[PDB]
Amino acid sequence: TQNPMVTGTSVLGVKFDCGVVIAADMLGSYGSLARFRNISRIMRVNDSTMLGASGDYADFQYLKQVLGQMVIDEELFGDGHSYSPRAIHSWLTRAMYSRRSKMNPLWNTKVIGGYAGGESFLGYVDMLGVAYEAPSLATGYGAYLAQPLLREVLEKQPVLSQTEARELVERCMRVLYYRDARSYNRFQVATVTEKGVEIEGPLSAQTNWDIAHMIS
Amino acid sequence: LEGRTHIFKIHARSMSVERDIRFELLARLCPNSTGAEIRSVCTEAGMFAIRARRKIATEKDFLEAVNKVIKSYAKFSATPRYMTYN
Amino acid sequence: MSSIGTGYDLSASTFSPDGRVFQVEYAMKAVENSSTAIGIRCKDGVVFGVEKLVLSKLYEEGSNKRLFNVDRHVGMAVAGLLADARSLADIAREEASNFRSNFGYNIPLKHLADRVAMYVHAYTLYSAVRPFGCSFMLGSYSVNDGAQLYMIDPSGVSYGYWGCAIGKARQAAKTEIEKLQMKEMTCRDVVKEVAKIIYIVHDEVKDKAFELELSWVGELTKGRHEIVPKDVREEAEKYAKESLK
Amino acid sequence: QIHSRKMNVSPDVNYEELARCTDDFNGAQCKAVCVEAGMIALRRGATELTHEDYMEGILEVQAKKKANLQYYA
Amino acid sequence: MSYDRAITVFSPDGHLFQVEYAQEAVKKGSTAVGVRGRDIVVLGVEKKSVAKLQDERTVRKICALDDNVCMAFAVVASVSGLTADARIVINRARVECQSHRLTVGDPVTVEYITRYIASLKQRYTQSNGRRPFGISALIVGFDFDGTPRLYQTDPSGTYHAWKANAIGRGAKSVREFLEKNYTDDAIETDDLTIKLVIKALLEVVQSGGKNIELAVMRRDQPLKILSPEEIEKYVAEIEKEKEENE
Amino acid sequence: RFSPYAFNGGTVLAIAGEDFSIVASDTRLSEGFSIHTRDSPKCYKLTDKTVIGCSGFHGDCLTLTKIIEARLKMYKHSNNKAMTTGAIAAMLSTILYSRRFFPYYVYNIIEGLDEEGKGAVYSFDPVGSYQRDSFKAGGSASAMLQPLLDNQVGFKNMQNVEHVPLTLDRAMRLVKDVFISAAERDVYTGDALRICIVTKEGIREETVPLRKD
Amino acid sequence: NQYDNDVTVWSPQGRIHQIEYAMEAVKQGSATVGLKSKTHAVLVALKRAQSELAAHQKKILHVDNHIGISIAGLTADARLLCNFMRQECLDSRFVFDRPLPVSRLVSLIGSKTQIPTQRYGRRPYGVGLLIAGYDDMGPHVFQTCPSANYFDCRAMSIGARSQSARTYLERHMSEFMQCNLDELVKHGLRALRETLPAEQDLTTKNVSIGIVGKDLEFTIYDDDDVSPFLDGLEERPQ
């Protein structure tokens, strides 16, 4: 392991997939060192009409991958004779851009969560900022992999294919917890859902700070 | 390739030269030769023959006549430029 | 002249005492051979109507198609030789893709058209290569630049039109545009009109037989270049047929 | 269709298929391909031209000088 | 480059034009004979066209590619020396010989140089806007073995070893007189091999020791190009031997 | 070996035992990039024919890059050489990667376990720097000797007769595999979740997930 | 003429005769038929050789684990193009790792073929290609010209005396769509035989098949399973 020094960081983005949808909470707010330059930032990208991706780690680095993915998609869609962006195509392509940069002694760090729906299969994939692809059950990204993920995994172990609602309470719960354990967080966070409709990510919505507990 | 052997056989009938001269041997020795060139071989064979003072052409004269044709005659020949148009 | 081994049609660096360039002109006669592609600017989008040549009996949709997507919101209809058109599609799509990446806003048609025209024009100047044997239209909708229609010929000109035709019938087809008020008019009504113009212009010796392909890029598609629905195609086909009788 | 009327032909062979294969023909040539196919047809013993005669017919009118088998395939 | 205009294009005669134009230019003149001995190989050219006012010391028509590889060249016309044309083949061959000796610790063989001549002619053929040299070279040299060799190449790039060969002004005529002169004693005695080269050159046109230049190589030792004064003494002794046999 | 800096770590330990035509390859069922294990699911193992099964482990970024490549080299080899992928595929790939990873130090041990397309079984071991050898015992990872020994003692039967008085059968190797994995958890603290053993035959791919004991 | 001295030489009509003349070269090539269902893409090909006392080298080439081609025309040029396609297909497998689209691959051949036809002092490539490929949108069987235009067909026959075979393709055009693998191959054989004279009926030896589909990757049957498709003989249907 190594990671570049991060200035503007995206941290804790959970993702767990339900049938023909995924629910995600990712912070909408990206601190730059100390100052929260944009409390309004969007870590969510549109590859194509039934794909979405959400990324953590250095926010800056995420934007480099967006453009390469963007230029490739622009050429490939619209024509749709048999060639277009497809769920497998976006996952692998984005992994290779990350691999290319892994070969150099500085790599561009973003850790990404792809939810896609390709030609016949609904996919929930994890892409790393050094490369690697797999299908995933639930994955965290950035700070979520060390800090909350095991308690999220534990809730998933009886029921691995539960509803949107059950996911929605966990995610809403997770911001009060974010503030408590890690520092470079804001409580204006973004709820992103990738569905068959498109990729929707409405603006930052908030709930309690809850660091006012002191009862022992 | 088969056709060049047949031009030798038709030309030999006109001539009164040996039939103990293999028509085929001449045909292999000069491939990529037009109809005119195969008649010049017979002609040449005769030129060597008159100098020696023979009435009949030999196989010796013949062998010599094809190796001169394959090397020398090719440069002058009409075919590279006319075949490109054709 | 046309039968020669030096200059004239071998070159295009050549000039006659009139000033003409014959090779660039021979390229123009080539676009003329196949059927018409029309593209009509609305104040809200572009609608295309293209004859899609049926060259066999074992066709599937999109076969020998002339509708391309240069950018997400640009469509491209070609007329004339399809061989030259495929190479032209790659070059136009490439100039647009990089534009989106860098600028991050929807390619202005005025810019894209200038770059492809320069490329066609570099070949017409040269005697080293021949110039493309097709003529194309690029048509687009954006709210960052408005609805634009451009046309590029084998010479290397880009000028904007508000309704254009390329292909055999274009002198006849263009006349039908002067009749129509199309500068201000919904893209829904204009589809009905491009379809009826094509059906009447076609005859069995410009090309054997065609498949009607209409395309959207307007308020209806929300600024996306897409192919029209099965419903849309058929009603526009119907109106073409009823007007034909 | 006009030409066919003058000689005699199968209805298993028409020009439309030959037109679809290659576009390296003209109206003077179309007459020539029908007249060519008839020579072979006649040589065999036939009171018609069939699909075989035409199919050979297109190849014969165009020159060869050594032909192909594994020269191009 | 910008030049790609045709100079060579293939013939239905199953030849390359330049190569054949070159081959006749070695038929018509510039007698070069080589014999292979049993300690020493000697090659000789006749004509540097010493008109008794020209220099003889610094003129080279036999050039040492290496110290164990040497070539004598020919192809002539109205432009009589095609020394220039040779000079390219000579310089590229010179580096290549030396280069082969750096990489591979065996002393470079004539067989390596002969394949290298076959590829140079050919490479010039395949490249656009380029033409084969007219040269034919009699490549002389020593192997790893230390065995004397004489190899001859043609303008196409096909090589054969030969004990004794003559080219120029009737290649076959000079060689068939010379064929009698090639005997077991002649090849054994080194001194007799030097005379064999000179004795062939004399058949086409007789006399001149300045016109004749020959270079000698012994073992892997460096090329020695003989003085014309050494040649004049030698032609005088050759002329008397002809009267003795005959 | 080396402590992850050059490329990301992703832990995992590989054991390999060759018999005569059955070869077991085991590595832990995990995808890692970070100290925690992302998901038990993996695509470390990839099969190219039933004839050859490859395992690349450790760093996940390395694992995906080389394994796909191996599928490309297989395709190329069937076309040109006219020998189906197998041993021949294996020797070729280890040279090109091992040049690639070793100046900036190697963090993946790819192990081609197969049968040749003419037959005879090979199990191939790279250090990380190009070598290919056929083996009847193999240990590979940072702990490149921790499994090696069990296969040396039990398979070879050098100063041992109580695993078999001869050499292991197919029935015997699979029994031993479950046992070995349970043992590994005790010693090596860089694992989470499950251990996956794939048994590669010329006639049967087998897969079994086995919980970390 | 002098509408075909170089491939830049226009005719007054506005056509390059050399590109057209390059199609006549495809007719010298061996007959190949391309058919598709809804699960397979099937290529039926004629192999010829100079020694029939020896096994005939395949006329089906490897491009991808689900893409195979059958060539009609120039043998060296078809292989020459094949390498550009092969490099891209295998590259597409590394990077994109989808099963690559026939429509995508085919347009890239269109850019490269255009280079010499655009360029002076050169020859077009006179080879016509039928590609079978299976992606996740189902099969596609595409025809690519000596020009650069493509057709997405359900069935196509380019090659020697291809008209005779089309008469069959026109007749069972509806059938192709429903088929399974077996049915596609028997129709292509019945088509293939027609090109050739009445009294010549194929052998397995000179038939190579490249089968592509949903249930399979890439397998070439040279005589392997060729015998059952051939069975059920039908001899030159008019």
Added chain:
Amino acid sequence: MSRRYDSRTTIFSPEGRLYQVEYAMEAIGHAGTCLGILANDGVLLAAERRNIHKLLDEVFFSEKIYKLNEDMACSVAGITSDANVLTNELRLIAQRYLLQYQEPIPCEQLVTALCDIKQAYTQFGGKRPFGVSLLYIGWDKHYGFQLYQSDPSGNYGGWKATCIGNNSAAAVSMLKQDYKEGEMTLKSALALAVKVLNKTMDVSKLSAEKVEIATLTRENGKTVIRVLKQKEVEQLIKKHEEEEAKAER
């Protein structure tokens, strides 16, 4: 288009000559007398100065006598145009050799580097060959005094005395008649060269505007390259002119 225009002058002819070199060969002959003679203490060049007017700047040392190195000098027969590019290139080559070896460059070493370039033009490329043939004079350690001639494809020949240009056959035969292989000294050697130039040239008394003569003389172990001035030249003219006067009687 392009091949048709290409006259195929780069093609070999069956006889074994290059058409271009042969046409260049004629370009040298139109042009003035350049002759070089070998002598035993120095060596001299005599070239025809073709720049006669009464209004001349003389911005160059000479327009035909070129000092290529600080140990070589040369004279020209051919076209002034080709001579100017060529003369510069001859300087970089002479000068680089001087850097590496640090001894005067052989006259033979100097013609060969250029030859590759000449040959390149003729055989392929469709580029004209240079219109000048150069007589290089020098002293190099190895042979002692030498003169080298180059031709339009770089064909080289070592010569004791040679002449190219206008009435080349007449000059070389005459010089062959009196002198054969290095029978004279440096003093006498200038008097023959001017004498030959005198007969060949239309003005039959010459001046220093008509002839320009350059000497290259080995003094105190080092090669001195000097273009002689007009004053020195008149002395040499009076010596030959007087010798001619006795001849008649």
Added chain:
Amino acid sequence: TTTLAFKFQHGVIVAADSRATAGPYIASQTVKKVIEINPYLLGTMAGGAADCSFWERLLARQCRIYELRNKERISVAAASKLLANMVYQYKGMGLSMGTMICGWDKRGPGLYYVDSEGNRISGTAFSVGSGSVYAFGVMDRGYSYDLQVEEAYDLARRAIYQATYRDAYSGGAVNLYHVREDGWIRVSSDNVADLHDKYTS
């Protein structure tokens, strides 16, 4: 002066002696392996240490020489194999190094032995070795080694050297691969274990 491929000259043959070893000298990664590889039948070599590096340079040496020998129909010498390896490896340097091969062939000037190492050293001596532990070994061996030893006579010499060497050496999981090279042929005398030869001798 070091192990891993080592050769000493005699008239009749050269001795080729090598190790079977995997990895660094701290542990093996296998037990079964033979690292001994036959690049040409001219002789055998094989090393260890930086594994990719030895194999890479020898493979280039093998390519150049074999093509030249096979096509030309002229046998390549000790001098030629050495010159190829030398020229290649300095260029490639900076891309790991550790080649330790011993070059043999019989030449026109008699039998020639050159030792090729990855520093760029090219050495002839009584006995030379490139790799690691033979550095100690060249000391005892020189005493028990004549300038010209017969093949049979040489086989007995190897057996004694080794048998004491295993006692001193603490590297396990090795075999001594013994080859005698009679010129442009290579034959394998025996591939005896280091553990076996201590008992025999």
Added chain:
Amino acid sequence: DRGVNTFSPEGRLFQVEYAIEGHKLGSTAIGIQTSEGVCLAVEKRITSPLMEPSSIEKIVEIDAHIGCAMSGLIADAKTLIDKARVETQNHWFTYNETMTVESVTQAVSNLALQFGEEDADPGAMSRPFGVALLFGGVDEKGPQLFHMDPSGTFVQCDARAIGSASEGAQSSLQEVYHKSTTLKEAIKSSLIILKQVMEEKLNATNIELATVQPGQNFHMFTKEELEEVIKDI
């Protein structure tokens, strides 16, 4: 004028039709695949005894267990053979085992047709080579004989002849040569066919034979071996 690059109304290129003729000009070479091994026979056809017969070669090695006889312009072929030598050993560095007859032949054939006379790179052909090569060896797979054409059409053969007698000889081989004829009989079949194109009778200085047989590397037959087949023809 018209170019040479153009396609004719026949439907073939001019340069290529000329190149086939170039194959026909040279000396005949026979390559027979037997299942006991692969023999390659070529005619020397010497006209002078001053030549040294060893150094007239027209069998050159692609590999150390693949031999190749070549026909047509001897020089034009030699370049293709030079590039082939570099690939076979190169194949040894990468695969770690020796190249097959099939792999080498397809790779040289790609180069065979590439031709663009004007406006094409000088690192690429202006004209195709007029050589037909016969690659004959026994490799990992077994005895294989592959035939390569100047048109860049490669095909597998068991008996192939190329050179002046190419059509005549090829027909005649199909007749005598079968896979019910042994390796020594293949050598006898080639010798008879050889004589029409030859100017003289068959001799051991007028043939060169080399056979690559299983389990063995390429052997160039010595004077004794050439003479045993000469005795009985």
